Design a protein around this ligand. Structure first.
Ligand SMILES: *[C@@H]1O[C@H](CO)[C@@H](O)[C@H](O)[C@H]1NC(C)=O
Ligand SMILES: *[C@@H]1O[C@H](CO)[C@@H](O)[C@H](O)[C@H]1NC(C)=O
Ligand SMILES: *[C@@H]1O[C@H](CO)[C@@H](O)[C@H](O)[C@H]1NC(C)=O
Ligand SMILES: *[C@@H]1O[C@H](CO)[C@@H](O)[C@H](O)[C@H]1NC(C)=O
Lengths: 439, 439
């Protein structure tokens, strides 16, 4: 037997559904959603880290001319200076006091620490979805897990379950994301091979194990100070450290709809969007014939209390006469009132007690117990507590939900006004006809 | 200095573009596209292979009653038969002649061969693209390779190249594909856990190394024959072998646009759709000043032959006087005529020879040689060969492209008819004016 239902995407709230098959007693199922997860598909682009500067010992040539050649190393620079006269701790180094030169050079390499301290950029694509459910079936709790689409099915206790697809494709991730030790940021990083001297992306490589490194820092050699041997230079500071000090709030704290974020692997969970259809296949052996179930012949209802708070603040007592001992199901016949208890045991001549919640200021509803129905009514009072720590268990109201006292006042005024118009209209009709016929 | 061009997505055809910078001599570049590759993103769903049936020795209990219990193994079946009287080579087995029973059972397992002979299903997502180019630059051939989007650049001989994005998103793959040893098919395979007894997907698993196996075959035990010991059964044949004998043609033979396919990894090659923009950055050192290049003062043109075939069927001779020896670039000033030669050498007083192709029945064009212009004209004859083995090297013609003889005939006929109308109008006007004034 095929049954189809729809459940809204709310975590931590039970829902009930009624199964009705001709010739058999009705059955009621209860379901609760525990978790929903989305998972995107990623592709790596490049990584960044710190740089190192390498400077060899200088070469000083006095009373001769020095020169140097070009090299293929990254950010290579070479310059020759004239007029030097270096000193050491023991006196002047060379005999010649004029026509001296000095040669200096430097280049840039990748830091050893990049194996541990680094950041990576990813390109994002369409995400998948999965869900986990609890089902109350034949008085026992069972669990299922499945992908949230139509291409998967599971079987538990000879019942088949299919879930999905989801009604919405909203995703909290952009096309370009950056991940660093548990944080995810939305950032439009610069193209590969087009970096900047003082921002994110000054050093680029494809993978931590590669040898090919790109750099776009500035490096200029300067004239040495008189009497000292050293190699001064000017260079722009590393951009990676600058980012760490100003990167700001992470995606976890700013995302809408209450989503939570994880990074290993990247995930987003419990996003409160849309609804999820469900389909169940129930085997024939689960049903009991109407000739075997007990019958109930007489009912009455009273309601001693009602407060329309967010919780189960209502109680009702129903009297019954049963023909024999057995089990019976209970279900509400309205949408504005929910009943907590799923079933009862009936015997002889006695009474049963149930609890309910509702938002109505004046409540009227019907309750069905083993194929018969009873009418209940009561008035409800407001609560006193301004703020609570949990969501409500009931649906919202519409324009039709009005107190019976207010409805009476509306009818009286509208009727009265209509009567004045109706009488005046009749007078005009009579006068016109008399004039017509007299002429 | 930036230069932006567009080249159509056709493999094996050269194209030329003109770079013109005030103060410097013009430069001509030539480019050719060698290959384009598309690569989709895949995820694995399930695999299929062959099945095995396991049957242990039967147990026979004569003049006693056998029984058996249920087990959790896939497709487990158990039955008891009465009234057996087995024989063996040496005589009847048991002393009792009546009240004998036999117990039989079987179950289904996964074949050992599944490690080598199997098929896999994938879900497809948005593909990436890459390209390989040849460039003629500074008189030498260089090559580049890049991703076909705006997020990548390369540097060769101090020139920067950016290629892409593509103008079209057409992809030859569907959402669901199946791959088997080099063949790719589009197939809507059944969902997991919902197979059929005689079709593709009767046995399913998640990965070749899994222990969890699903099967939906039929297996029924039958009564044994009199006087023998055996275990007959009825079972549906394997669906996997049926597919292999009936799978039909693969995408490589049926796909549109002439696309080629490879499977390791899955790729589509040389699909002829759309066009590709390109941007180049040329350094200043490559340019030569107009004061240093030679000048040409006198030009003439003679064209001894032209046949407008698909190949280069035209020849022209140009006369020149040059101020000094040097290099010179040539370029066509029209769209309907393409010139094969990119550069010439000029010295003294001499002549040069060029070749061209066009579809025009009557050709007229200008040629630029070192910043001067020469005018050429000719009539062309048709070819005699019906079919060739290569695409044309020239553009198509429009409605305005008409031979000079036909144009003269059209003008004469239209002019004559128009003159007759003009005269008749004048006569009518004068007569009407006379009547107006006289009345
Ligand atoms: C731990 O160290 C390994 C290398 O030894 C590195 O790959 C990894 O990112 C480190 N993890 C953390 C949390 O620092
Ligand atoms: C298990 O079922 C019982 C009813 O017999 C119910 O009270 C309980 O909440 C269920 N367990 C969970 C975790 O919901
Ligand atoms: C070769 O055999 C291995 C297993 O031994 C299998 O995984 C692979 O697909 C085979 N390749 C071909 C081309 O048959
Ligand atoms: C390579 O350059 C030469 C000129 O030096 C040219 O003739 C040749 O056609 C080029 N190669 C290709 C494949 O076009």
């Amino acid at each position: 037997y095929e049954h189809v239902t729809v459940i809204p995407n709310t975590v931590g709230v039970p829902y009930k559904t009624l199964v009705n098959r001709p010739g058999y007693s009705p059955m009621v199922l209860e379901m609760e959603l525990q978790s929903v997860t989305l998972e995107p598909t990623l592709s790596l682009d490049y990584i960044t880290c710190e740089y190192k500067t390498v400077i060899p010992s200088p070469y000083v040539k006095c009373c001769g001319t020095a020169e140097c050649k070009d090299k293929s190393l990254p950010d290579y620079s070479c310059k020759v200076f004239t007029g030097v006269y270096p000193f050491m701790w023991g006196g002047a180094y060379c005999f010649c006091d004029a026509e001296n030169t000095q040669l200096s050079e430097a280049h840039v390499e990748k830091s050893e620490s990049c194996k541990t301290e680094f950041a990576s950029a990813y390109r994002a694509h369409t995400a998948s979805a999965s869900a986990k459910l609890r089902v109350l079936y034949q008085g026992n709790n069972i669990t299922v897990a499945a992908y949230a689409n139509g291409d998967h099915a599971v079987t538990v206790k000879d019942a088949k379950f299919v879930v999905g697809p989801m009604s919405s494709a909203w995703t909290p991730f952009d096309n370009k994301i950056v991940v660093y030790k548990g944080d995810v940021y939305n950032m439009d990083y610069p193209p590969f091979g087009a970096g900047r001297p003082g921002q994110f992306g000054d050093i680029q490589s494809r993978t931590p194990e590669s040898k090919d490194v790109y750099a776009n820092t500035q490096l200029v050699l300067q004239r040495p100070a008189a009497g000292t041997v050293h190699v001064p230079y000017s260079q722009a500071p590393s951009g990676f450290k600058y980012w760490l000090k100003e990167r700001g709030a992470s995606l976890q704290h700013t995302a809408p709809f209450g989503c939570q974020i994880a990074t290993n692997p990247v995930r987003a969970v419990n996003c409160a969007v849309g609804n999820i259809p469900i389909s169940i296949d129930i085997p024939d052996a689960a049903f009991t014939r109407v000739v075997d179930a007990p019958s109930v012949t007489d009912m009455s209802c009273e309601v001693p209390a009602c407060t329309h708070s967010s919780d189960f603040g209502g109680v009702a007592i129903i009297k019954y006469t049963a023909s024999k001992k057995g089990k019976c199901a209970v279900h509400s016949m309205t949408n504005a009132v929910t009943i907590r208890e799923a079933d009862v045991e009936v015997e002889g001549n006695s009474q049963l007690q149930i609890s309910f919640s509702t938002a109505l200021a004046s409540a009227e509803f019907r309750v069905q117990v083993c194929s018969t129905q009873v009418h209940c009514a009561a008035a409800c009072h407001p609560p006193k507590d301004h703020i609570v720590n949990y969501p409500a268990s009931h649906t919202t109201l519409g324009v039709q939900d009005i107190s019976t006292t207010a409805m009476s006042w509306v009818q009286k005024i509208t009727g009265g006004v209509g009567l004045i118009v109706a009488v005046a209209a009749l007078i005009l009709i009579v006068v016109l006809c008399v004039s017509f016929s007299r002429h």
